[PDB]
Symmetry: C2
Subunit: 104 residues, 2 copies
């Protein structure tokens, strides 16, 4: 992909879900038309997903230290990647995936 990530020829299927429509009380006398009324409705539940990942271990002889992604040492108003006063979770900056080095 241009956005990055993995291209796949058989991606994970997409799950589709809908409330089963519940019609309100239809009239007594038959009517040819389809039922235009329904009971306002919504549903809630829990969903769980796991992904088993495979890693390629980093095996390298570079003498000096590498570069690593690390949180700031210095004080700040409030913790990054954590909630704020009013409870709004916030992530300050994007995280690149490339730090460790490899000989071309």
């Amino acid at each position: 992909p241009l956005m990055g990530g993995f291209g796949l020829k058989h991606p994970p299927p997409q799950i589709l879900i809908k409330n089963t429509p519940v019609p309100a009380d239809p009239p007594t006398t038959f009517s040819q038309a389809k039922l235009a009324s329904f009971i306002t409705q919504y549903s809630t539940g829990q969903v769980s997903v796991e992904i088993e990942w495979e890693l390629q271990k980093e095996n390298s002889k570079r003498w000096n230290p590498e570069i690593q992604y690390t949180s700031n040492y210095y004080k700040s108003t409030n913790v990054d990647f954590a909630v704020n006063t009013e409870g709004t979770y916030s992530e300050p900056r994007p995280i690149g995936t490339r730090y460790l080095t490899r000989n071309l």
Copy 2:
């Protein structure tokens, strides 16, 4: 220890080594005195040492990133922990052992 490290009641033994003294030519007529002359000498070789270490894996639920020891991202005159122009190896700063965090 106060310097840090591990205290031990049976530390690794200390290896001691010496050139076996080689006397120069003593006189023909016997002499009571011990031999005061020797052949100037030195020896060279290779030494190898390995240490099998045990680690306590870090298992922790902290949500936000930790602090990590990482080399500078920004450019510098020359690489740290690596040789300089004239070939003098140099280590810029001490390295503490404590970064990862643990709930007291």
